[PDB]
């Protein structure tokens, strides 16, 4: 967007076992990264490996 614009976004990762977050308060309980949009135009949120089994199926 424009450079003179300001906005704050929160990227939330929901590990398996729980449904998809339907609200922000439910999403922010899990792994999340608050993104402050400014001079840095890109955010890098690494989805952590949170699984019991060592490998997941691609399908």
């Amino acid at each position: 967007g424009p450079a003179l614009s300001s906005a704050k976004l929160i990227l939330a990762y929901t590990p398996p076992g729980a449904r998809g977050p339907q609200d922000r308060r439910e999403a922010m309980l899990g792994t999340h990264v608050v993104w402050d949009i400014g001079l840095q135009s890109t955010i890098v949120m690494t989805i952590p490996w949170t699984s019991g089994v060592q490998f997941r199926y691609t399908d």
Partner: protein, 273 residues
């Protein structure tokens, strides 16, 4: 190795024959503790009692039947056996399934032998020199739909070409996601009131689709492909109770109604021999 040690009359306060099984321990009471024994040696190593030999001998674990004929006009091919696919399961034959179920966790690289025999009950002047293509299908690989599908290229799917009667021999490293196969999985794949119990990612290893690639002769050659399996690099954990009731399904310990007795009733009272 010493089998039985020499022991004479014993008159002491230490009673190795008396214990308390309420503790859950099995005292290694030897014959020298109850009677007078002589010096004897084992002369036995136990190489055939190891899990690597008990579970690691080639045996038949699945079978199917197919045909190689003029497939013109058969809209549903696979269901007409122009090629058949089998989900890899070590729980379809019982005499090996029980040995595998004797433990809770088993880790092994596998060995497969696919046995196909040519035959013609109907009028057929000869038995063709077939070349069977055996194909491994990993989860996601396109489950073929026709005998001539875009899958048989086998660029990522493993393929093995061979003639009927002679068998393929390919090894498979342990393809489980865990450190072993979940011989018992007291757990669900996910939390849903309509999901299947036990049969999960740990169970599905893919499937083996059988066919022939040679173009048809003048007759139906009903091929029965019997699959043999040997277990390699076998490791076992958490020994379990032997299987008593038979099976009806794969991966499920479910049994039928009104099952037959397994204990051999005596002839007479408890005092009979």
């Amino acid at each position: 190795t010493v089998a039985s040690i020499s022991s004479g009359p014993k008159h002491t306060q230490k009673v190795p024959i008396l214990t308390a099984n309420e503790t859950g321990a099995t005292m290694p009471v030897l014959p020298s503790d109850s009677i007078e024994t002589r010096t004897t040696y084992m002369h036995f190593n136990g190489s055939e009692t190891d899990v690597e030999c008990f579970l690691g001998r080639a045996a038949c674990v699945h079978v199917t039947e197919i045909q190689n004929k003029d497939a013109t006009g058969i809209d549903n091919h696979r269901e007409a056996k122009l090629f058949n696919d089998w989900k890899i399961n070590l729980s379809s034959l019982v005499q090996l399934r029980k040995k595998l179920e004797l433990f809770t966790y088993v880790r092994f690289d596998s060995e497969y032998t696919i046995l196909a025999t040519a035959s013609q009950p109907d009028s057929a002047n000869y038995s063709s020199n077939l070349v069977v293509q055996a194909m491994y299908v990993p989860p996601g690989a396109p489950n073929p739909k026709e005998w001539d599908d875009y899958t048989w290229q086998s660029a990522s799917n493993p393929s093995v070409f061979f003639k009927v009667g002679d068998t393929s021999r390919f090894s498979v490293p342990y393809v489980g996601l865990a450190s072993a196969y979940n011989c018992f999985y007291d757990g669900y794949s996910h939390d849903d009131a309509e999901t299947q119990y036990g049969i999960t990612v740990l169970n599905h290893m893919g499937s083996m689709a059988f066919r022939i690639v040679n173009e048809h002769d003048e007759h139906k050659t009903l091929v029965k492909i019997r699959v043999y399996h040997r277990a390699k690099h076998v490791e076992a954990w958490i020994p379990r109770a032997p299987r008593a009731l038979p099976y009806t399904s794969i991966g499920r310990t479910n049994y039928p109604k009104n099952t037959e007795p397994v204990i051999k009733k005596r002839k007479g009272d408890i005092k009979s021999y």
